[PDB]
Design a protein around this ligand. Structure first.
Ligand SMILES: [Cl-]
Ligand SMILES: [Cl-]
Ligand SMILES: [Cl-]
Ligand code: NA
Ligand code: NA
Ligand code: NA
Lengths: 135, 155, 134, 159
């Protein structure tokens, strides 16, 4: 699982997710990566999200869309929505992983409940930030 | 304007990984996010930026997508991808493909050149080939690192 | 496409959807029916939904989950959420079809924006209601 | 709330001008029989999961409806079937897409839910999972109906 989210100069949001699945996977099993609203979602009016983790839990919890709906309908900020999904709801179903998100206001979040998540972000015309481990 | 990328979440420990090992990932993430930043700075679209970032993460054998995909139980590769455009709410996705070098470009093709969101398996592949995407052997994805991780995971 | 939603005496919701897709479909195309949150969703906290319609739009709209999220987070009634998704949001994206939904209080909705939808529902120990047209 | 079931057999351009009452009652009778089965099960204390599984299984069996027996034809004059089931109690789900050799996709979806750590399986992988758990292999021809074959022909040119 790899992914990208972006907000362009025109205010467009976009998300993309790509994966090889998981080591020793049986044939024809599908996780969250190719599923709209589970592993990948974008709407100019809310957020762009790409996910990575226990596929079945990201599907059951519709993780990517749940970020948008918690913000849109629940009035949560991006930070609050990410905390709710990644640190509460995913573990509640036995689910490990993380996600990257940008909202329409340019807030960026890279929540994960795992030992690490390969990640990076940067604003245009700024130095990028990278990370592997927690805090 | 802003980009964020990931190359997967899970049980990364420090006691197992050297600094030179870690720096290869840091340098890889750096170059890709920087490519994305420069595209955004140049006024390229969010769609084109996430497509190119994920294409680069696919090409990079360090990341479990495209080249450097994990091995299935049957020691081949099955790849999946999605792309969504927040401007139109259009999306494209392929699942269970083995003969497309860059699943995210296949997904973008489903988005733009089909009325569908999602295609699977040989239907997805034949759809892409009928629009001039190259057929590849899944052997191109295979790496020693991921084979070694398959043998380890079997124990 | 076919589906069923139900609430049982223990207060559990469930949803199921099944399809052969669309006449003259090319191989390997997947619509909303097998996708959680698109053609099928159930949560004891909100609603059970089974959809039928333009698969591409129901996926892009996460039609089934959107009903649940409008009720759970937005505090919309089942009727209001169904109106919003089926009569407003889906048509705005070029989607025709409908859905069946039961909430955790046993409210039932069978919204559709098409000429017809083969549908029926009934309370346990009651006579069933059947319909095709508006 | 009172236990309750709803079913559908698909939404589309259905108009009164197109059918006789006797032709309508064929659809009404099928929907009534299946919803009555669900109602009786709910009244006897059976689970919402077991009721929707059986209701969709019956809708698959019923040739009038585009799932299982009575599936529409693909371009290639075969059948590709998809199904999902979700349990609101556990939030577990199971789903199969693109299967042609399973009589009842909803039962295969329910097998994915209950007898795997995964939510979604596709094509031959989904089929082989189902066969390894003892589900019967069928010819895709079993789904084929004159009614749907005629719809395929009216929708295209011959050559
Ligand atoms: Cl770090
Ligand atoms: Cl971990
Ligand atoms: Cl060093
Ligand atoms: Na790669
Ligand atoms: Na092959
Ligand atoms: Na049928």
């Amino acid at each position: 699982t790899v992914g990208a989210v972006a907000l362009d100069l025109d205010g467009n949001l976009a998300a993309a997710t790509s994966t090889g699945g998981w080591t020793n996977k049986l044939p024809g099993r599908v996780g969250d990566s190719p599923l709209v609203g589970a592993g990948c979602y974008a709407n100019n009016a809310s957020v762009a999200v790409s996910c990575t983790g226990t596929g079945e839990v990201f599907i059951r919890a519709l993780a990517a869309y749940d970020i948008a709906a918690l913000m849109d309908y629940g009035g949560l900020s991006l930070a609050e929505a990410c905390e709710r999904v990644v640190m509460e709801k995913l573990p509640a179903l036995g689910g490990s992983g993380g996600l990257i998100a940008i909202d329409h206001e340019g807030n960026v979040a890279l929540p994960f409940n795992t030992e690490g998540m390969y990640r990076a972000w940067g604003y245009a015309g700024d130095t990028p930030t990278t990370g592997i481990y927690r805090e | 304007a802003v980009i964020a990328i990931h190359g997967g979440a899970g049980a990364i420990s420090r006691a197992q990984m050297s600094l030179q090992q870690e720096l290869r990932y840091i340098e890889a993430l750096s170059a890709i996010v920087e490519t994305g930043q420069k595209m955004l700075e140049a006024g390229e679209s969010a769609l084109d930026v996430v497509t190119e970032a994920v294409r680069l993460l696919e090409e990079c054998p360090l990341f479990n997508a495209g080249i450097g995909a994990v091995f299935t139980r049957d020691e081949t590769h099955e790849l999946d991808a999605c792309v969504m455009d927040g401007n139109t709410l259009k999306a494209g996705a392929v699942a269970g493909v083995s003969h497309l070098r860059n699943p995210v470009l296949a997904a973008r093709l489903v988005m733009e050149q089909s009325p569908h969101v999602m295609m699977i398996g040989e239907g997805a592949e034949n759809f892409a080939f009928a629009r001039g995407m190259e057929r590849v052997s899944p052997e191109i994805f295979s790496t020693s690192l991921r084979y070694e991780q398959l043998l380890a995971a079997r124990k």
